[PDB]
């Protein structure tokens, strides 16, 4: 189906923002497993799953609007520590719930309503779980100290 | 059945009791639940619905008894930090108990022994379950600290 | 996350109305079953647990937006004869979906997707559950009498 | 064990008043069956179980007690159409309330509790069972018309 | 094969005409849905399929016969109330019932004994289920009354 | 519940619009069939049942809505041809993808959001099975002769 | 039972001719096997059984009706390839639709309704399976070419 | 339905052929295990029911077609002696089969081809199953002899 | 929860009577066994095990008071002859159902309702299963002589 | 582990090489499955996870001998036809091979045996999976032509 | 077979070293498992098998080569505290990891290319396993401290 | 793939030398059993799987090199007694050793790591297996006698 230029670049760029927090995710997940935390290791590799099948969903869509996907994952900033871990993905989760707001008011005044409900399922995806989950981290080492907490993630 | 207006008015009274204690352990639960303290959300789930079983066994009771039920919930005063939420569950059972005691003794004055020994189940529950297991949590707090204490309810 | 002021205003006038719905089904359920119209109460039990589950997903949702959930419902005014409690719940359902149809409206106004994704599951629960079943029972009324209906709902 | 003479003449009359209540749902159940109102045939015959387990109760505590079991039934007086067995019930489930709530009485001032605890039992059975039921049946026809419930009888 | 241009032309018009009957089970059986008859759904839902077979079947045959099958079905005219859509159903059966008489005799005027047979099947559908089933709802009505007979199909 | 006037409209040109996209799957499955092209057969047939099922949503919606169906489906053109019956589910995926796109804005505007999300599910259906489905057989062709892809479907 | 002589003779022209079919797909199966076309081998196979299954049933049918049965096969003409293989098919199958009407109606003519149930079973086995499929064949030759179409067969 | 008053009367001579028919199986199965034949028992009581299955076919068609039926069975005239038995049931059955082939001829003229349809059914069991059975068994006394036949009864 | 000081040292009295009662049996149970009467062994074995039941139950509940359970058990006085041991098991049981019935007035007149239905369901147990069996067992004794009962505690 | 800084730094080189060959295998695996070949897209959606499972071992293995995993995929160029697609990945596999080679050479000087191993399993995967298969695919067409070899791929 | 004097007599080296670390692994299991460590009893008895597995192979191995074991284990060192303990096996796999990889260099230069390949797997084991294991903890106790650590390990 | 010529050349001396080897297993294995030793009929026959096994690898290797194999084996001399068949295995596999470690270092030189891995698995194999089991009889004939250990191998 021919469709609308300007959606398919934006699928575009929230393709390759998916392919990146899914590379983030990637690389955070095999970090927490080296340190010995298996319990960040499942869920950062759950949630890499999840962006993979976020990309999976925009790529075949911008195929089925005769669109080429742009492959190149946007630049990672992985952290180093597991404060600056969470952190990147703080920061990851709230730029990707930001892009995808923007799309779907993009689909709507293209008249694109199929497009329209795959990101407002990515962004419930994305504050629901990701956003969610990783707020719940960050307040339990606020209530228990970093030390409690990483202990519990063993 | 014909019930005694004063033996009805006062299931009114532990009923709207029982609507505001399901409230309560409701949003408690779900507070619990956003900081990411999986067991306390559970506990307080089912606090919630074992609360929801007394208003039901009132409210049936004071149909039988050609009573009209009052539905509107006592006012509720929640917690907004875990130690605010245990004192403020810590009031509420102290109370029902009261409430509860009393309602017993009125049976008795007036003969109502079913309206009697349901109430006093629910005392029961009240005191060995609710009370006691809040108890638990407040003597492991005093003896290892809010913060271990906080960890293991992950 | 920080939700909008005026949205997280709104999903707690959506919360107690759903928290009050919540209580007239329990209510009228069970004046249903205490006067042995026992399919009368499957069905408003149904409807109770229903909207104990919209209530829930509203109250979560509010605290994922870091609001702070209003949990008093709103007043109810249960029916005294089955033909008031058919006309109070015709009543309850008409306002849900115009108080949801506006709180869809603003979601959208405050760009929270998400937030008004909950709102459109909830008002198809209402319209195609709710509204649809009480009318089918209206409508039986009409066509084969009062009485005949309530003998087939025993 | 010796029990107090007036707590076993009590039960003495408690018994004969169950062994009563046991024949006449024995005959109002076999009654409705010949007419061939089957779901009123099994809820009596359901309530001629009980009164006799209630009889068999009361009969083993007056043995236990010393006592001699007095084994004539009370008079009973049948209804000889519907209206009038229904009637007939409501009457006997008053008496047996009345007659049990003086026996609780009783027992509690000759410090017998655990016959209390068994009158308690069986007053219980009598309120949210027997006479529970037989309002509900009361007021269905008085929703619906005698006609109209009876076939809903069959 | 090469079918009698006659024949095609026939079972075309027997084709509109199922295509018809098909889509008036179809709105018929929805209304009675939405009025809450579920047992009036369920078998005008049947009477839907069966027809939905016989169009299949002739439309089937029609391109054996190397014909082009007329896919417009007949116009039609559903009822607005229980009584006038039974009518309208009653109408229907009598018309198909005629026109498959007239093709049965076309066939075999045509020597085309497979498509005969075709109809001869469709002919004791049309008498034995629809025809039937229809004039016993019809008599039920009769004797027991249009509100008696409604009841019996929620 | 009483519908937008103009919603209800416009709900029953979607109808009669996917009452002839049933049809038209309906004569060109059959007729891939006869030809000896079963998968061919098999996926269209799939089609039909998934526009008889959109036609039932929008119908018992209508209903709901109080409004009247209109039955009758929109004319159809069948191809003769595989070619010309491709291109005819060409031509009718484009328009209904239209026809949806148009009904998703109107009831947007009559604020009708439950409508609209039928509307909106039918339209993902529309574009990422039927149109999809269609645009890779003709690819196919494209890419192997119409000889090999035709060979593929036996 | 005694059987008219003219519908006797025919049904022995039918056998004769049905045991001729019967060998006539007995030799063309096992020369498709023999080349390696396996589904053409089953295809074929599949029919052999049929005719001499209905060579069966008219052999039984002449015995009760106290005839002698005529078995010789009628002379059979085999392809040399698959062309020649599939118009010999064709012609047969014609060849054996036009006796079996004429038995048919010679069966109306001297009564024997019994015989004429028998040839109409076998007429309509004649037509939807052997010739119908034969068609397809033919059909599917003509759209994608012989080569494909006896790869796709293999 | 209104059945043409020519076909309903002659159903009516079917009807109470078959009833008789089915009391003759009935009197000579019994007769034959009184003797100590167990397998001529068995298959004329088997006969017996499907002669029952045949005018319980005739009557509800008698009444869809809005006839009264007429059930005095004609009279029969039973055998003393297996070989009279065995001729009465053979006169019997080339009876029925005469009555049938007139009314199949009958049911064509009024174009009840329904009726017909029954008709033939009843005509194939009758000569297939009772007639071919009968023969079978005097052909086997004419090759063996009536001694050796009734010992192969037992 | 603060306890009464005057229930909590009478349950105190009760649990200390409770530990004797426990390691009465427990010696009881053990000289049947050394002596060879098993059936005497199992039943003293079974009430040593209830009594360790009833203890706990005082022992947690004494806890939940925030009182210090008293763990000395009274004095025992076991039996030296198998008469002996069912008169000191009499006395027993006579005492401990006699300390039960004071702590039941006792915990009614400091409305501590709980704790009074634990007792309640102790002296239950103490007169329905313990005092009742040890009964039998003397009349068992008194009817058939002392080595007869023995003969058969085997 | 502390591992030699140039094998480390080749890792990472291996590493951004894999996560380039798990991109290109993800984008040609679904622009084959847009165009239709169900063969090629599951082929592809294979390799494209075990380049993903040889890049998670080298990140791990990166993370083990403590360095810092580059995660930015190499360029990827992509096909737009069948033929260049197959191109693209002869040239990607190609590379790898080398680069593996390369780096299998460079272990073994800086005595790291373990990554050796892991690096020579790579490329037994790579040689004797994906280049051995994409030959095979090339070596097809060259044998039968594109259009028969991509029909054979549907 | 004839193994090189300079091959058997290192393979000894590492049998000798497999011994002891086999030995130090036993005692510091069961030093955990004295001190109520269970998972880190858990994981060091695994080493244990582990190294018994390498020793084993290394025995048969030199024995195939014709060499005779050398079995007397290595010095051990074991700690007294858990950190000492940690710090000797770190030191200990530090040792093993250089000790293999000679032997590796030495099988190669003396073309044993089966005892270097024994060795390979032994020194992966060694690294992934043992040595990654145990900066595992290591980084734990860094990140957590000693006592959150070793709560952890029970 | 491109193999380097004199890695294809001596991969074909090595499959030359497996077929041989293949070859004297098969011989030998079926000398031994014709004399009535399963045993080493056995474990001969699973020899000369192995070498099948071995064959097959390094053929597919040469193919996937672009190499053409070559497929006549070595010549073979097989025992005449069991002393000289083991003999003259022993020779085999010391010959098989030989050249397989000659082409693990031609492997190393051409950079061809995977056909260098593939004969290091055949050496394992050859000595762990087939050279070991070989000493393994040897030692056991010298330890025992020949007549001892042939009776043991029946
Ligand atoms: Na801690
Ligand atoms: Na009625
Ligand atoms: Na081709
Ligand atoms: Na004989």
Not at 32 to 47: I, M, P, T, V
Not at 123 to 147: P, S, V
Request: glycine share 6%; aromatic share 8%; proline share 3%.
């Amino acid at each position: 189906m021919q469709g609308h230029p300007e959606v398919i670049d934006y699928l575009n760029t929230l393709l390759t923002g998916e392919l990146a927090a899914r590379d983030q995710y990637f690389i955070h997940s095999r970090m927490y497993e080296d340190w010995g935390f298996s319990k960040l290791y499942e869920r950062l590799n759950h949630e890499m799953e999840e962006e993979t099948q976020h990309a999976d969903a925009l790529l075949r869509r911008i195929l089925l609007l005769e669109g080429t996907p742009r492959m190149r994952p946007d630049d990672i900033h992985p952290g180093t520590t597991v404060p600056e871990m969470l952190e990147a993905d703080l920061k990851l989760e709230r730029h990707v719930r930001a892009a995808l707001a923007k799309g779907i008011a993009l689909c709507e005044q293209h008249k694109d309503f199929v497009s329209r409900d795959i990101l407002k399922a990515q962004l419930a995806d994305t504050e629901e779980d990701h956003a969610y989950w990783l707020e719940q981290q960050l307040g339990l080492i606020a209530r228990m100290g970093l030390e409690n907490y990483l202990q519990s993630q063993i």
